Amino acid sequence: NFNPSVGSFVWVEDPDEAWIDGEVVQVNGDEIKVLCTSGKHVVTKISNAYPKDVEAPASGVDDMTRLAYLHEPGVLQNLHSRYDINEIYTYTGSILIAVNPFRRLPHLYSSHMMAQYKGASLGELSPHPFAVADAAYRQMINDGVSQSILVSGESGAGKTESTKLLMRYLAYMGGSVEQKVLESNPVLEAFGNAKTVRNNNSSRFGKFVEIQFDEKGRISGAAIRTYLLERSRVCQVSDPERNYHCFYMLCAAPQEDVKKFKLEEPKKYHYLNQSKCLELDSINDAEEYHATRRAMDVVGISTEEQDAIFSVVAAILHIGNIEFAKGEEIDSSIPKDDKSLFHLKTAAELLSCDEKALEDSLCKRIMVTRDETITKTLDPEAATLSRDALAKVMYSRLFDWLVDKINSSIGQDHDSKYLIGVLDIYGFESFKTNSFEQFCINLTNEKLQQHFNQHVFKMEQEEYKKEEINWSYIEFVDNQDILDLIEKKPGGIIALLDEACMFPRSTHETFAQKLYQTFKTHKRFTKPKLARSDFTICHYAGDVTYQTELFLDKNKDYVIAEHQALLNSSSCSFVASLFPPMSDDSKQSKFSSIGTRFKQQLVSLLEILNTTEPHYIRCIKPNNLLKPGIFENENILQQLRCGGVMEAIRISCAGYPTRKHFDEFLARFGILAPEVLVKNSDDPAACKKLLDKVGLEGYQIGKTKVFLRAGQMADLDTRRTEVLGR
Ligand SMILES: Nc1ncnc2c1ncn2[C@@H]1O[C@H](COP(=O)(O)OP(=O)(O)O)[C@@H](O)[C@H]1O
Ligand code: ALF
Ligand SMILES: [Mg+2]
Ligand SMILES: [Mg+2]
After folding, report:
1. Which of 191, 205, 559, 673 could form a disulfide with 693 if both were Cys (CB 3.0 to 4.6 A apart)?
2. Rounded distance between C-alpha atoms, residue 81 and residue 53, angstroms
3. For this UniProt entry, which residues form the secretion signal?
């Protein structure tokens, strides 16, 4: 076991900074007194203490499994040391660990650096996402099976940056399709990314990039898949956060390019004024407009199609400045001041429709009756809800048109045999107020971590028990019950939300009370005492309390009748093309459920990833100030524990990554030792004896399969290739 010396350096617990560095000064029977470099003297039992590796280089260890002292402080200190010398990447078994640098490293990601990793093995070079990308490319041809790379972490930990690296390297192995997949990121980030408290350039939509490869290995096609874009940001923004980049790009654009839009300072427009943050130090909005147009030309978006897109973006900004006051008649709406009539006229001119038809779209809805057509009027509060509804649907139809035009140039089938898919989702985020959009984001992260848990801890250890192997079970925290809490078919938070959405005039307190009487006897569900309509979920990353105030509203997906009627009446080809013409030999739907639609998309994505061989990259956010050179133990310790990094190191150190059937084993490696006899095609004793003849040790013989350590299968294929070639 462990026995501390009278004078030695050990790790001890501390209220802050997690573990602290100390030196024992006194030794009792079972307790010891440590002395930290800080000077404080702590007293604790020996079992709480952990030995410290004094002989540790600043470079640390490239693999956490090769660490001399496997425990939490050594993992934390190995990470910290490599972070100080700008070595952000580090391996854990086959998994890659990435700590956010929060600074530019041009040499670490140059195209020359790609050539260095072109033929490199996973462990030959220093850890890098290019090595994970190459591993996915090599394992695709050696197996003929599709691959997928899965990037995880909390919000702002570097998933989107990590995905850009994988795409730049994957385009290098198959190489005009390559250029357009790389230029699709700036276009989508202009309309799907915005500043939050967690990330200055936070992804508000999840993407799944699919790279197609033919049998020869060329990049035949590529496709991008986007999931639940947040459109509520268009209308309501918190003070720290910012609206989508496109709005600020257009206000910083050269005046001759946007002279027709009649744009003002950003602080004037209602959809941006709520934030009170209009500029970013890390983002130059003027350059982003020039970069986005440049990227749009690469994808093939016509310059005339670019003008109509920005006309919609500038129109949405004008629409937000249309205030409503009480009309002369009861429950009537009218523009408040003459400035709202300016914006109402401008937004109609930018949308190529009638100014009065636009005004009648927000102030007055029409009731549907077979006997005659009647028009009611709206109160100012109802009219405000009608203009915010118009903007959201206009922005999502615009964002969806982009993803359709992107794949209309880079998406095609050349009868390819397999693909590689890198997955970029939104990270687990928690704010002082948590809406329905957060509920789906954290659900997505919850589902991805379960996939990690299954393919790393559940499926691996079931085989170990199945094969009668000598093995100590490694316990872990499973989040399956949280998934059953949300997407259970016979009553889940998603399923219950559709129930309350069917009943008209259902308040958020009724859906709230329904959650309490149903999930009362549950471990992962909690209710705040003073909050009637707020519910808390014990997420794997931490407790998050949600507000159901807007849950029923965010879930219903519908198109306002007079909204689609106006947008269809537009003289501009692009504006009318944003809404499909329904009701002509077509079915009319009351509303569609976003919760079930998003759940269905999440299951289909999971089923495609279950047919591919996965590769994991765990991103880590080192600090919350979004600045470099700040390594915080508490932030990183809580991410390692809830992410299961400690258990993964334990499974990678003692586990067996590769297993082959006896018949597959004697066929390939029986040629290594011709003198070793074999009784039949699947004889287990020959496997034991053929491995001893080669000199391998630590292997384990199972019920029906052999089990080898991380690098033991690799040298057997190299030994085989040498003898068969001779
Ligand atoms: N490899 C990297 N090189 C440079 N900056 C990085 C890198 N990874 C992350 N960052 C920084 O972290 C920020 C957030 O990263 P991002 O990919 O947006 O995380 P997430 O997708 O999880 O929100 C970036 O805007 C950038 O400043
Ligand atoms: F932009 Al994120 F998690 F915050 F992908
Ligand atoms: Mg992102
Ligand atoms: Mg929404």
Report:
1. 673
2. 13
3. none
Look up 160 and say whether it is catalytic: yes
**In Å, what resolution does this model reach?**
2.8
Pocket of ligand 2 (CB under 6 A): 155-156, 159-160, 198-199, 202-203, 426-427
Q: For 526, phi and psi rounded to 5 degrees?
A: -140, 150
Distance of CA 675 to the CA centre of its chain: 53
Q: Which ligand is nearest to the CA of 200?
A: 1
String of DSSP letters for 284-336: -HHHHHHHHHHHHHHHT--HHHHHHHHHHHHHHHHHHT--EEE-SSTT-EEE-
State residue 58 phi and psi, 5-degree precision: -65, -35
Question: What is the Cα gyration radius of the chain?
Answer: 29
Cα(319)–Cα(385) distance, integer angstroms: 12
Q: With contact defined as beta carbons under 8 Å apart, do 154 and 542 qualify?
A: no
Å from CA of 158 to ligand 3 middle: 7
Query: What SS3 class is residue 546?
Result: strand
Ligand nearest to the CA of 162: 1
Beta-carbon contacts of residue 261 (< 8 Å; ≥ 6 apart): 250, 310, 311, 314, 350
Angle, CA of 554, 319 and 243, to the nearest 5°: 60
Catalytic-residue membership of 429: yes
Resolved by: X-ray
Ligand 2 atom closest to the Cα of residue 441 is 3
What distance in Å separates the CA atoms of residue 340 and residue 338, rounded to the nearest whole number? Answer: 5
For the chain, list the domains and their CATH numbers.
Answer: 9-51 (2.30.30.360), 64-301+410-427+612-652 (3.40.850.10), 316-401+559-583 (1.20.120.720), 436-557 (1.20.58.530), 656-725 (3.30.70.1590)
What is the C-alpha separation between 449 and 458, in angstroms, rounded? 12
| 75 residue type, one letter | V
The closest of 601, 250, 190 to 398, measured between CA atoms, is 190
Q: List, chain by chain if needed, residues with CB within 6 Å of any ligand 1 atom.
A: 100-102, 104-105, 153, 155-161, 199-203, 427, 619
List the catalytic residue out of 429, 446, 467, 487: 429
Looking at this protein, which amino acid is placed at residue 5? S
Measured from the alpha carbon of residue 436, the closest ligand is: 4
User: Do strands 366-367 and 374-375 pair parallel, antiparallel, or not at all (unpaired)?
Assistant: antiparallel
Identify the active-site residue in 185, 203, 311, 434: 203
Residue 27 forms beta bridges with which residues?
32
Q: Clarify whether 155 is annotated catalytic.
A: yes
Q: Look up residue 210 and give its two tokens.
A: 């699919």
Q: Which residue among the candidates 427, 643, 655, 702 is catalytic per the annotation?
A: 427
204 is known to lie in a ligand binding site: yes
Q: Kindly state the DSSP code that residue 428 receives in the 8-state scheme.
A: B
Q: Is 427 a catalytic residue?
A: yes
